[PDB]
Design a protein around this ligand. Sequence first.
Ligand SMILES: CCCCCCCCCO[C@@H]1O[C@H](CO)[C@@H](O)[C@H](O)[C@H]1O
Ligand SMILES: CCCCCCCCCO[C@@H]1O[C@H](CO)[C@@H](O)[C@H](O)[C@H]1O
Length: 372
Amino acid sequence: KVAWLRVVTLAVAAFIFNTTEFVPVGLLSDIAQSFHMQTAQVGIMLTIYAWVVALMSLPFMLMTSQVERRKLLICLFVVFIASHVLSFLSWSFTVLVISRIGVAFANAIFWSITASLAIRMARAQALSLIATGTALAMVLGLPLGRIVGQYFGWRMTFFAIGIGALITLLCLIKLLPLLPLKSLPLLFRRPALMSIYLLTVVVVTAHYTAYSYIEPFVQNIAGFSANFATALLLLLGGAGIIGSVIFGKLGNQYASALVSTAIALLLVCLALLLPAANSEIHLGVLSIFWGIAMMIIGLGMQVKVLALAPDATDVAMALFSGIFNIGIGAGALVGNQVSLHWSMSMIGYVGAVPAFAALIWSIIIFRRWPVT
Ligand SMILES: CCCCCCCCCO[C@@H]1O[C@H](CO)[C@@H](O)[C@H](O)[C@H]1O
Ligand SMILES: CCCCCCCCCO[C@@H]1O[C@H](CO)[C@@H](O)[C@H](O)[C@H]1O
Protein backbone atom coordinates (compact mmCIF):
# COMPACT_ATOMS: atom_id res chain seq x y z
CA LYS A 1 0.00 0.00 0.00
CA VAL A 2 2.24 2.75 1.29
CA ALA A 3 5.00 0.28 0.48
CA TRP A 4 3.89 0.83 -3.11
CA LEU A 5 3.57 4.58 -2.43
CA ARG A 6 7.26 4.87 -1.60
CA VAL A 7 8.42 2.69 -4.44
CA VAL A 8 6.17 4.96 -6.58
CA THR A 9 7.71 8.16 -5.16
CA LEU A 10 11.06 6.56 -5.99
CA ALA A 11 9.96 6.07 -9.61
CA VAL A 12 8.89 9.70 -10.07
CA ALA A 13 12.32 10.68 -8.69
CA ALA A 14 14.01 8.34 -11.16
CA PHE A 15 12.00 9.95 -13.96
CA ILE A 16 12.97 13.44 -12.71
CA PHE A 17 16.66 12.56 -12.30
CA ASN A 18 16.86 10.93 -15.75
CA THR A 19 14.93 13.71 -17.54
CA THR A 20 17.56 16.32 -16.57
CA GLU A 21 20.38 14.13 -17.90
CA PHE A 22 18.44 13.93 -21.16
CA VAL A 23 17.04 17.45 -21.67
CA PRO A 24 20.25 19.30 -22.79
CA VAL A 25 20.17 17.33 -26.07
CA GLY A 26 16.90 19.09 -26.97
CA LEU A 27 17.85 22.57 -25.68
CA LEU A 28 21.32 22.82 -27.23
CA SER A 29 20.43 25.69 -29.59
CA ASP A 30 18.22 27.45 -27.06
CA ILE A 31 21.12 27.26 -24.60
CA ALA A 32 23.62 28.26 -27.27
CA GLN A 33 21.38 31.22 -28.13
CA SER A 34 21.34 32.63 -24.58
CA PHE A 35 25.14 32.49 -24.24
CA HIS A 36 26.01 33.45 -27.88
CA MET A 37 27.80 30.21 -28.81
CA GLN A 38 27.42 27.83 -31.68
CA THR A 39 25.31 24.86 -30.73
CA ALA A 40 28.19 22.37 -30.93
CA GLN A 41 30.29 24.21 -28.31
CA VAL A 42 27.38 23.75 -25.87
CA GLY A 43 28.17 19.99 -26.12
CA ILE A 44 30.95 20.62 -23.58
CA MET A 45 28.31 20.73 -20.83
CA LEU A 46 27.44 17.15 -21.84
CA THR A 47 31.01 15.85 -21.85
CA ILE A 48 31.70 17.57 -18.53
CA TYR A 49 28.53 16.31 -16.86
CA ALA A 50 29.15 12.74 -18.00
CA TRP A 51 32.82 12.58 -17.07
CA VAL A 52 32.09 13.86 -13.56
CA VAL A 53 29.50 11.10 -13.05
CA ALA A 54 32.05 8.63 -14.41
CA LEU A 55 34.97 9.59 -12.18
CA MET A 56 32.73 9.90 -9.12
CA SER A 57 30.14 7.14 -9.40
CA LEU A 58 32.41 4.45 -7.96
CA PRO A 59 34.05 6.73 -5.32
CA PHE A 60 30.72 8.32 -4.32
CA MET A 61 28.96 4.97 -3.92
CA LEU A 62 31.68 3.75 -1.55
CA MET A 63 31.87 6.86 0.63
CA THR A 64 28.06 6.91 0.96
CA SER A 65 27.77 3.20 1.81
CA GLN A 66 27.64 3.92 5.56
CA VAL A 67 25.10 6.80 5.33
CA GLU A 68 21.46 5.94 6.00
CA ARG A 69 19.55 6.35 2.76
CA ARG A 70 16.77 8.68 3.93
CA LYS A 71 19.39 11.14 5.19
CA LEU A 72 21.38 10.46 2.02
CA LEU A 73 18.45 11.00 -0.34
CA ILE A 74 17.56 14.35 1.28
CA CYS A 75 21.07 15.77 0.91
CA LEU A 76 21.41 14.61 -2.69
CA PHE A 77 17.96 16.07 -3.42
CA VAL A 78 18.98 19.38 -1.81
CA VAL A 79 22.12 19.46 -3.98
CA PHE A 80 20.02 18.55 -7.03
CA ILE A 81 17.42 21.28 -6.41
CA ALA A 82 19.97 23.97 -5.55
CA SER A 83 21.93 23.11 -8.73
CA HIS A 84 18.84 23.49 -10.93
CA VAL A 85 18.11 26.87 -9.33
CA LEU A 86 21.72 27.71 -10.19
CA SER A 87 21.16 26.55 -13.80
CA PHE A 88 18.02 28.70 -14.03
CA LEU A 89 19.78 31.91 -13.00
CA SER A 90 23.26 31.02 -14.30
CA TRP A 91 24.94 34.17 -15.64
CA SER A 92 27.45 32.44 -17.97
CA PHE A 93 27.95 29.15 -19.78
CA THR A 94 30.68 28.50 -17.21
CA VAL A 95 28.19 28.97 -14.38
CA LEU A 96 25.76 26.68 -16.22
CA VAL A 97 28.45 23.99 -16.49
CA ILE A 98 29.28 24.41 -12.80
CA SER A 99 25.58 23.88 -11.98
CA ARG A 100 25.75 20.75 -14.13
CA ILE A 101 28.65 19.45 -12.00
CA GLY A 102 26.35 19.87 -9.01
CA VAL A 103 23.59 17.75 -10.56
CA ALA A 104 26.17 15.14 -11.58
CA PHE A 105 27.10 14.64 -7.92
CA ALA A 106 23.49 14.08 -6.93
CA ASN A 107 22.87 11.73 -9.87
CA ALA A 108 25.98 9.65 -9.13
CA ILE A 109 24.88 9.08 -5.52
CA PHE A 110 21.27 8.71 -6.58
CA TRP A 111 21.87 5.78 -8.93
CA SER A 112 24.00 4.10 -6.26
CA ILE A 113 21.11 3.48 -3.90
CA THR A 114 17.85 3.63 -5.85
CA ALA A 115 17.58 0.00 -7.01
CA SER A 116 18.46 -1.19 -3.50
CA LEU A 117 15.81 1.05 -1.95
CA ALA A 118 13.26 -0.21 -4.48
CA ILE A 119 13.79 -3.87 -3.53
CA ARG A 120 13.82 -3.08 0.20
CA MET A 121 10.09 -2.26 0.02
CA ALA A 122 7.42 -4.68 -1.19
CA ARG A 123 10.03 -6.86 -5.45
CA ALA A 124 10.94 -7.76 -9.03
CA GLN A 125 8.19 -5.45 -10.32
CA ALA A 126 8.94 -2.96 -7.64
CA LEU A 127 12.18 -2.69 -9.63
CA SER A 128 10.25 -2.24 -12.88
CA LEU A 129 8.62 0.83 -11.33
CA ILE A 130 12.07 2.43 -11.24
CA ALA A 131 12.72 1.41 -14.85
CA THR A 132 9.39 2.74 -16.11
CA GLY A 133 10.31 6.14 -14.64
CA THR A 134 13.48 6.01 -16.72
CA ALA A 135 11.32 4.84 -19.61
CA LEU A 136 8.98 7.81 -19.15
CA ALA A 137 11.99 10.13 -18.97
CA MET A 138 12.93 8.86 -22.45
CA VAL A 139 9.64 9.17 -24.31
CA LEU A 140 7.98 11.89 -22.20
CA GLY A 141 10.66 13.55 -20.05
CA LEU A 142 13.01 14.63 -22.86
CA PRO A 143 10.35 15.53 -25.48
CA LEU A 144 8.13 17.46 -23.08
CA GLY A 145 11.16 19.19 -21.56
CA ARG A 146 12.17 20.43 -25.00
CA ILE A 147 8.64 21.78 -25.65
CA VAL A 148 8.78 23.64 -22.30
CA GLY A 149 12.18 24.93 -23.41
CA GLN A 150 10.75 26.26 -26.68
CA TYR A 151 7.88 28.10 -24.93
CA PHE A 152 9.38 29.11 -21.59
CA GLY A 153 13.07 28.82 -22.40
CA TRP A 154 15.72 26.38 -21.25
CA ARG A 155 16.15 28.11 -17.87
CA MET A 156 12.51 27.54 -16.89
CA THR A 157 12.94 23.93 -18.00
CA PHE A 158 15.71 23.55 -15.43
CA PHE A 159 13.74 25.58 -12.87
CA ALA A 160 10.65 23.37 -13.29
CA ILE A 161 12.77 20.22 -12.88
CA GLY A 162 14.09 21.43 -9.51
CA ILE A 163 10.61 22.37 -8.27
CA GLY A 164 9.35 18.89 -9.14
CA ALA A 165 12.24 17.32 -7.23
CA LEU A 166 11.33 19.65 -4.34
CA ILE A 167 7.77 18.39 -4.41
CA THR A 168 9.13 14.85 -4.67
CA LEU A 169 11.59 15.48 -1.83
CA LEU A 170 8.71 16.49 0.48
CA CYS A 171 6.72 13.36 -0.34
CA LEU A 172 9.91 11.39 0.37
CA ILE A 173 10.32 13.11 3.74
CA LYS A 174 6.75 12.23 4.73
CA LEU A 175 6.82 8.77 3.17
CA LEU A 176 10.31 7.41 3.90
CA PRO A 177 11.02 5.27 6.98
CA LEU A 178 14.38 4.88 8.72
CA LEU A 179 16.87 3.49 6.21
CA PRO A 180 19.89 1.86 7.86
CA LEU A 181 36.79 -1.78 -2.93
CA LYS A 182 38.55 -5.16 -2.67
CA SER A 183 36.43 -6.28 -5.67
CA LEU A 184 38.27 -4.21 -8.31
CA PRO A 185 41.37 -6.47 -8.74
CA LEU A 186 39.24 -9.61 -8.99
CA LEU A 187 36.91 -7.89 -11.45
CA PHE A 188 39.88 -6.42 -13.32
CA ARG A 189 41.22 -9.98 -13.71
CA ARG A 190 38.05 -11.15 -15.57
CA PRO A 191 38.77 -10.51 -19.25
CA ALA A 192 35.16 -11.28 -20.24
CA LEU A 193 33.92 -8.57 -17.87
CA MET A 194 36.76 -6.22 -18.90
CA SER A 195 35.83 -6.90 -22.54
CA ILE A 196 32.23 -5.82 -21.97
CA TYR A 197 33.45 -2.57 -20.34
CA LEU A 198 35.67 -2.06 -23.38
CA LEU A 199 32.75 -2.79 -25.67
CA THR A 200 30.58 -0.42 -23.67
CA VAL A 201 32.89 2.58 -23.92
CA VAL A 202 33.52 2.11 -27.66
CA VAL A 203 29.90 1.55 -28.72
CA VAL A 204 28.53 4.37 -26.53
CA THR A 205 31.10 6.76 -28.03
CA ALA A 206 29.75 5.72 -31.44
CA HIS A 207 26.15 6.42 -30.52
CA TYR A 208 26.78 9.77 -28.80
CA THR A 209 28.98 11.22 -31.54
CA ALA A 210 25.71 11.62 -33.46
CA TYR A 211 23.03 11.51 -30.80
CA SER A 212 24.47 14.44 -28.83
CA TYR A 213 23.95 16.82 -31.77
CA ILE A 214 20.82 15.38 -33.33
CA GLU A 215 18.95 18.61 -32.54
CA PRO A 216 21.30 21.00 -34.41
CA PHE A 217 21.84 18.24 -36.99
CA VAL A 218 18.10 17.97 -37.72
CA GLN A 219 17.50 21.73 -37.95
CA ASN A 220 20.78 23.01 -39.38
CA ILE A 221 21.91 20.05 -41.50
CA ALA A 222 18.68 18.28 -42.51
CA GLY A 223 17.02 21.67 -42.30
CA PHE A 224 13.74 20.30 -40.99
CA SER A 225 11.66 22.26 -38.54
CA ALA A 226 12.22 22.63 -34.79
CA ASN A 227 9.05 20.60 -34.25
CA PHE A 228 10.39 17.82 -36.45
CA ALA A 229 13.30 17.44 -34.01
CA THR A 230 10.88 17.08 -31.08
CA ALA A 231 8.98 14.33 -32.90
CA LEU A 232 12.22 12.50 -33.80
CA LEU A 233 13.11 12.50 -30.11
CA LEU A 234 9.73 11.00 -29.24
CA LEU A 235 10.27 8.41 -31.96
CA LEU A 236 13.68 7.62 -30.45
CA GLY A 237 12.18 7.55 -26.97
CA GLY A 238 9.38 5.27 -28.13
CA ALA A 239 11.77 3.21 -30.24
CA GLY A 240 13.80 2.72 -27.07
CA ILE A 241 10.70 1.44 -25.26
CA ILE A 242 10.16 -0.98 -28.15
CA GLY A 243 13.76 -2.20 -27.94
CA SER A 244 13.31 -2.49 -24.18
CA VAL A 245 10.41 -4.93 -24.54
CA ILE A 246 11.98 -7.23 -27.17
CA PHE A 247 15.07 -7.41 -24.98
CA GLY A 248 12.99 -8.20 -21.91
CA LYS A 249 11.38 -11.10 -23.78
CA LEU A 250 14.47 -12.66 -25.43
CA GLY A 251 17.38 -11.10 -23.55
CA ASN A 252 18.00 -13.86 -21.03
CA GLN A 253 19.04 -16.31 -23.77
CA TYR A 254 19.83 -14.19 -26.88
CA ALA A 255 21.62 -11.22 -25.27
CA SER A 256 24.90 -11.83 -27.16
CA ALA A 257 23.15 -12.29 -30.49
CA LEU A 258 20.88 -9.33 -29.70
CA VAL A 259 23.84 -7.10 -28.78
CA SER A 260 25.81 -7.76 -31.98
CA THR A 261 22.74 -7.54 -34.22
CA ALA A 262 21.86 -4.24 -32.54
CA ILE A 263 25.44 -3.03 -32.99
CA ALA A 264 25.27 -3.88 -36.69
CA LEU A 265 21.94 -2.05 -36.87
CA LEU A 266 23.43 0.95 -35.02
CA LEU A 267 26.42 1.03 -37.36
CA VAL A 268 23.97 1.13 -40.29
CA CYS A 269 21.91 3.96 -38.78
CA LEU A 270 25.03 6.03 -38.09
CA ALA A 271 26.24 5.59 -41.69
CA LEU A 272 22.82 6.40 -43.18
CA LEU A 273 21.97 9.36 -40.93
CA LEU A 274 23.19 12.06 -43.33
CA PRO A 275 21.83 10.20 -46.41
CA ALA A 276 18.46 9.73 -44.70
CA ALA A 277 18.41 13.44 -43.73
CA ASN A 278 16.80 14.45 -47.02
CA SER A 279 13.58 12.54 -46.29
CA GLU A 280 11.79 13.31 -43.03
CA ILE A 281 10.22 9.84 -43.08
CA HIS A 282 13.60 8.21 -43.78
CA LEU A 283 15.04 9.96 -40.72
CA GLY A 284 11.91 9.15 -38.72
CA VAL A 285 12.02 5.51 -39.76
CA LEU A 286 15.80 5.38 -39.23
CA SER A 287 15.43 6.77 -35.71
CA ILE A 288 12.98 3.98 -34.89
CA PHE A 289 15.73 1.49 -35.67
CA TRP A 290 18.33 3.71 -33.99
CA GLY A 291 16.23 3.88 -30.81
CA ILE A 292 15.60 0.12 -30.79
CA ALA A 293 19.26 -0.64 -31.51
CA MET A 294 20.86 1.52 -28.82
CA MET A 295 18.62 0.37 -25.95
CA ILE A 296 19.12 -3.31 -26.76
CA ILE A 297 22.88 -2.63 -26.86
CA GLY A 298 22.78 -0.95 -23.46
CA LEU A 299 20.65 -3.57 -21.71
CA GLY A 300 22.46 -6.49 -23.29
CA MET A 301 25.79 -5.33 -21.89
CA GLN A 302 24.17 -4.46 -18.56
CA VAL A 303 22.91 -8.04 -18.46
CA LYS A 304 26.39 -9.27 -19.37
CA VAL A 305 27.81 -7.22 -16.50
CA LEU A 306 25.37 -8.90 -14.10
CA ALA A 307 26.06 -12.36 -15.55
CA LEU A 308 29.82 -11.78 -15.17
CA ALA A 309 29.93 -10.20 -11.67
CA PRO A 310 27.13 -11.63 -9.50
CA ASP A 311 29.70 -11.65 -6.66
CA ALA A 312 30.03 -7.87 -6.90
CA THR A 313 27.16 -6.32 -8.89
CA ASP A 314 27.27 -3.07 -6.88
CA VAL A 315 30.82 -2.10 -7.83
CA ALA A 316 30.38 -3.76 -11.24
CA MET A 317 27.32 -1.57 -11.77
CA ALA A 318 29.18 1.44 -10.42
CA LEU A 319 31.96 0.55 -12.86
CA PHE A 320 29.55 -0.06 -15.74
CA SER A 321 27.75 3.22 -15.16
CA GLY A 322 31.07 5.01 -14.85
CA ILE A 323 32.48 3.70 -18.11
CA PHE A 324 29.07 4.11 -19.78
CA ASN A 325 29.32 7.81 -18.93
CA ILE A 326 32.88 8.05 -20.18
CA GLY A 327 31.49 6.99 -23.56
CA ILE A 328 28.78 9.65 -23.22
CA GLY A 329 31.34 12.39 -22.69
CA ALA A 330 33.61 11.04 -25.41
CA GLY A 331 30.74 10.97 -27.89
CA ALA A 332 29.85 14.58 -27.16
CA LEU A 333 33.50 15.65 -27.41
CA VAL A 334 34.13 13.83 -30.70
CA GLY A 335 30.82 15.09 -32.03
CA ASN A 336 31.84 18.57 -30.84
CA GLN A 337 35.14 18.36 -32.72
CA VAL A 338 33.70 16.90 -35.95
CA SER A 339 31.14 19.73 -35.92
CA LEU A 340 33.55 22.58 -35.18
CA HIS A 341 36.52 21.62 -37.35
CA TRP A 342 34.93 19.55 -40.15
CA SER A 343 31.12 19.71 -40.17
CA MET A 344 28.15 18.35 -38.21
CA SER A 345 26.97 16.32 -41.22
CA MET A 346 29.96 13.95 -40.94
CA ILE A 347 28.69 13.25 -37.39
CA GLY A 348 27.02 10.07 -38.69
CA TYR A 349 30.07 8.81 -40.60
CA VAL A 350 32.54 9.59 -37.81
CA GLY A 351 30.35 7.75 -35.28
CA ALA A 352 30.27 4.80 -37.71
CA VAL A 353 33.99 4.04 -37.31
CA PRO A 354 33.91 3.04 -33.57
CA ALA A 355 30.52 1.36 -34.07
CA PHE A 356 32.20 -0.90 -36.61
CA ALA A 357 35.10 -1.58 -34.27
CA ALA A 358 32.59 -2.41 -31.52
CA LEU A 359 30.71 -4.78 -33.85
CA ILE A 360 33.87 -6.79 -34.59
CA TRP A 361 34.78 -6.64 -30.94
CA SER A 362 31.34 -7.89 -29.91
CA ILE A 363 31.54 -10.71 -32.47
CA ILE A 364 34.99 -11.63 -31.11
CA ILE A 365 34.26 -11.68 -27.41
CA PHE A 366 31.00 -13.60 -27.76
CA ARG A 367 32.89 -16.32 -29.62
CA ARG A 368 35.48 -16.39 -26.82
CA TRP A 369 32.96 -16.44 -23.93
CA PRO A 370 29.62 -17.72 -25.30
CA VAL A 371 28.02 -19.18 -22.13
CA THR A 372 26.84 -16.78 -19.44
C1 LIG B 1 42.46 0.74 -21.70
C2 LIG B 1 42.32 0.40 -20.25
C3 LIG B 1 41.17 -0.55 -20.11
C4 LIG B 1 39.92 0.22 -19.79
C5 LIG B 1 38.83 -0.69 -19.35
C6 LIG B 1 38.02 0.14 -18.40
C7 LIG B 1 37.97 -0.46 -17.02
C8 LIG B 1 39.03 0.21 -16.19
C9 LIG B 1 38.75 1.69 -16.10
O1 LIG B 1 38.18 1.93 -14.81
C10 LIG B 1 38.30 3.25 -14.31
O2 LIG B 1 37.80 3.36 -12.99
C11 LIG B 1 37.88 4.69 -12.48
C12 LIG B 1 37.10 4.75 -11.19
O3 LIG B 1 37.21 6.08 -10.72
C13 LIG B 1 37.31 5.76 -13.39
O4 LIG B 1 38.33 6.69 -13.73
C14 LIG B 1 36.66 5.17 -14.60
O5 LIG B 1 35.65 4.41 -14.00
C15 LIG B 1 37.42 4.03 -15.22
O6 LIG B 1 38.37 4.36 -16.20
C1 LIG C 1 37.90 5.98 -27.50
C2 LIG C 1 37.82 5.72 -28.99
C3 LIG C 1 39.23 5.72 -29.58
C4 LIG C 1 39.77 4.28 -29.68
C5 LIG C 1 39.73 3.74 -31.12
C6 LIG C 1 38.60 2.68 -31.29
C7 LIG C 1 39.20 1.28 -31.55
C8 LIG C 1 39.02 0.28 -30.40
C9 LIG C 1 38.55 -1.06 -30.97
O1 LIG C 1 39.39 -2.08 -30.54
C10 LIG C 1 40.24 -2.59 -31.47
O2 LIG C 1 39.76 -2.54 -32.89
C11 LIG C 1 40.81 -3.09 -33.75
C12 LIG C 1 40.71 -2.80 -35.21
O3 LIG C 1 41.69 -3.59 -35.84
C13 LIG C 1 40.70 -4.56 -33.52
O4 LIG C 1 41.58 -5.23 -34.41
C14 LIG C 1 41.17 -4.80 -32.14
O5 LIG C 1 40.79 -6.17 -32.01
C15 LIG C 1 40.54 -3.99 -31.06
O6 LIG C 1 41.44 -3.73 -29.99
